């Protein structure tokens, strides 16, 4: 793996991370407005 490829991979993983966080937020809204009990921690 070349240097350019490694830097591109970091950028790619960071972009994916943003998309995953956005998706989690979208899905969580539904949960919070239906059955938020699953969000409890102990």
């Amino acid at each position: 793996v070349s240097r350019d490829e490694l830097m591109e991979a970091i950028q790619k993983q960071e972009e994916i991370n943003f998309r995953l966080q956005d998706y989690i937020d979208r899905i969580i809204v539904a949960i919070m407005e239906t059955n938020p009990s699953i969000l409890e921690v102990k």
């Binding site: 966080q21 956005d22 989690i24 409890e40 102990k42």
Partner: protein, 167 residues
């Protein structure tokens, strides 16, 4: 079980200590290696107030400097909020205004707000003068206190105080 249920949310920059304030209050636990929070969670703790059993429902989520799809639901029904910053990182204090604005745009108008300067154990690295934060709080009608989730200083007091103001 309880007489009153009060929803209180934690807000503030990533890394200021929100999750450890939650763990200290609800489980008497601190984790120096805690990782950034994923999703949204809440934990409960029952305390005594004026002879009444109060069930505090504390909500937590990562402090992402961005509007989120969960924002509306997060503040919904909340009667209290802890706006947290890191006394050792002036940047987290500068962002307090941004968090307060977000709160004013989604939370109930009568929500009780307490400005919390966490990580007081790092006083040797203080970057936010106590007097300045207190001035900002009183100016915006916010309670104020400095805490250390690490050594536990004022953590119980912070929650007890805000819950007492709510009730």
């Amino acid at each position: 079980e309880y007489d009153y249920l009060f929803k209180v949310v934690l807000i503030g920059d990533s890394g200021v200590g929100k999750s450890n304030l939650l763990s200290r209050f609800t489980r008497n636990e601190f984790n120096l290696e805690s990782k950034s929070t994923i999703g949204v969670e809440f934990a409960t703790r029952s305390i005594q107030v004026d002879g009444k059993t109060i069930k505090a429902q504390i909500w937590d989520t990562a402090g992402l400097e961005r509007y989120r799809a969960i924002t509306s639901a997060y503040y919904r029904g909340a009667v209290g909020a802890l706006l947290v910053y890191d006394i050792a990182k002036h940047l987290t204090y500068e962002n307090v205004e941004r968090w307060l604005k977000e709160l004013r745009d989604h939370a109930d108008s009568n929500i009780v707000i307490m400005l919390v300067g966490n990580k007081s154990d790092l006083r040797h690295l203080r970057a936010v003068p106590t007097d300045e934060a207190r001035a900002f709080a009183e100016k915006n009608g916010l309670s104020f206190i400095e805490t250390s989730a690490l050594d536990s200083t004022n953590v119980e007091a912070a929650f007890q105080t805000i819950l007492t103001e709510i009730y």
